[PDB]
Amino acid sequence: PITINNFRYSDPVNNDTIIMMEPPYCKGLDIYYKAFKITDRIWIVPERYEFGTKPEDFNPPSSASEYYDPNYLRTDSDKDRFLQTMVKLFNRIKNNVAGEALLDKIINAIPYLGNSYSLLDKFDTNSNSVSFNLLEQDPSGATTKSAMLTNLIIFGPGPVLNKNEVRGIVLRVDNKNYFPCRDGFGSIMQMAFCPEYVPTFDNSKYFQDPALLLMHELIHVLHGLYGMQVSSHEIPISAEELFTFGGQDANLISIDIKNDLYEKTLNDYKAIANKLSQVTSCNDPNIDIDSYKQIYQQKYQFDKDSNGQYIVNEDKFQILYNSIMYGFTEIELGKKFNIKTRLSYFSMNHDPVKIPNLLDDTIYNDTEGFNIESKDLKSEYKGQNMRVNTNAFRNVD
Amino acid sequence: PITINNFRYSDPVNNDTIIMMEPPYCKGLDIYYKAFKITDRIWIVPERYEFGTKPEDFNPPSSASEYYDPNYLRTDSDKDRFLQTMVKLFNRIKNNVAGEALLDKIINAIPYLGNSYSLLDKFDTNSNSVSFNLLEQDPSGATTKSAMLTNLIIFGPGPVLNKNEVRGIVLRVDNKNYFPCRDGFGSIMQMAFCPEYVPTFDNSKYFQDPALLLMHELIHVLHGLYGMQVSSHEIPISAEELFTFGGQDANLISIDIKNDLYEKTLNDYKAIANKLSQVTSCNDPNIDIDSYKQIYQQKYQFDKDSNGQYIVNEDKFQILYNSIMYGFTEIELGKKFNIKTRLSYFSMNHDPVKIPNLLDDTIYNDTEGFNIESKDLKSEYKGQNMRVNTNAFRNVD
Ligand SMILES: [Zn+2]
Ligand SMILES: [Zn+2]
């Protein structure tokens, strides 16, 4: 099954589960941060998401739903707290059969080694869109620089402590933004996440389970890895959000768009089948190109031509498409998790609330979260109720 | 894949896809009706569901949502019409990857050869709860009587032409009703279905796609075959309905009940694993008892003990449970089918409407139903809209 490594923020680097990585956007800049492999293909970096920000952004400019605090995640203590909370959360997601399924799908959706603008016959790992640099420590004593591939890298929140988000690596090709996670190739996905500040709802009020907030963002991660991240298809919200929530809100996206998206992804995949059909080599010699042809064939659910050409099989594609866009949603995951969800995606999300002690097994555990049955809090989701589980949360301001 | 046989109501009997069967409730009564194997384990019998009715019931007693008409499905013509409409409907369900999945799951969920009250160490086919008698025609010329197992038998509507329904075979053991389709063993499931009279909704009004009405009932059939048909668990509707609809309405069932149901099915399965673990023989010699141990092991997702004893594996059971109760719902099927669904299960279901020509490819086809894109009726589900597709429906009274 899936293993969720353990580690204290003080643990030394080991070139395996604990390293010093230069995040994808800091490529060539030689700026490293300690990171942790929570599990295969997924890393955690206890640092605020600063990319594309300026310190002026990192505090409440004068001019609740937009809470700030520039000191959050700045000391080693905060970081080890952040690190531990994330581990419990992943373990919480892994211990439910439906959570294990999601992580499994995300771990295997490795980004294709290339994109719409890379040599068609060659697998390419030389791109921050697919690989990040790290600092290794030779057995000799020397400290060298190398690189590895990954699917997901999770950070702490950006300026807005309560605004979780998932962005794919943007490549600047021919003076314009290109998204390998919308072309079907997939790319490293990055997450800005804050486990502590959860939203509340009423459509008696409830506060949300942070673990569900994580799976929600993970679903965006899933769409990305398969390269089908619905762009800023605003309509006035992006279809990407609706698909992720689920239930009837998903049907707010017109057949016309859904069909246009489906047809577009299909084209993207036919193109990738063709491309994969010419890869004969790879810049990086430490790569079994034949092993990847196999992995990628399972990823996109392709078949081999009488002559060997990889081809898209409509039926298999449709099953995979439904799986990627419908198989995992906040409504169904909330359902399969004994977790309360807000009525509709458009349901108000009142002032966030802070959960100070998710590390306290008496408040939140990795098998029932807040709804601990032994505290008769499983029933009616009372563990999430604000009038009942009064001690598990504190107000913002 | 799945084959959906074809046949005209006039076609002769062949002891294969067209026979003369004594329905399960007419067992020993020697009353036969022509039936048709639309596909493996599923039969269609163009006859009104009369079991437990009296002619007085079969017409509008004086004293729209309860329409009647005792002459419906009485002539060979009506029956061949009913027969053809059902074939198109099944083909319609089979041509969508999500429809093929449902039928596949239903065809393989064969009722366990036995129940809570049959010899534990022996597979038993001698029960109308698992088998029906038919009339065969020897190559000699003689006409003999025999029997075969089946999962589903679909009839025409009962007294209420617009009230579709799915009941499992009730066994009378020790002067009380026993339901092998609630104990986890499963049993032949029977359907009373009317393809012509569909409901309408608004929460501009729409009429429903009969093929979706069929899958809805099929979902009840699915629950039954796996023996987990939520009883008359009224709360004030039966949880069985809510699970079948889906979306947020599914969450109207309290954790307490859902948990009680889950725990109960788990017990039922542990018990079946134990029972299957002692079957050494079978009354019916034309049965590879070892072949069935294999099929049943896949059905209930069991594993073999170091010593060989079949055992329930919590995780595999949970995946199978979610699959059976969440994997197929009206909301998700409607979604994956370009079909309009009513907002919530509690959404009003106005006077039914009659679709006179489902056999007219210009009105309904086996790939897009009413929402034919060539007639620019795919978009916005206009094919289901009442103001737009005016010719595809006629009012009741
Ligand atoms: Zn989101
Ligand atoms: Zn129903």
XYZ file of C-alpha atoms and ligand atoms in Angstrom, chain B residues 164-166 216-217 220 240-241 244-245 330 345, ligand 2:
13
model
C -41.980 1.687 -11.812
C -40.707 -0.615 -9.070
C -38.175 -3.264 -7.998
C -32.641 4.122 -11.608
C -34.631 0.939 -11.128
C -32.258 -0.990 -6.886
C -33.027 2.914 -0.247
C -34.538 5.681 -2.348
C -30.382 5.532 -5.325
C -30.959 9.204 -6.157
C -29.399 8.696 -10.605
C -35.102 13.676 -4.836
Zn -36.738 4.038 -6.748
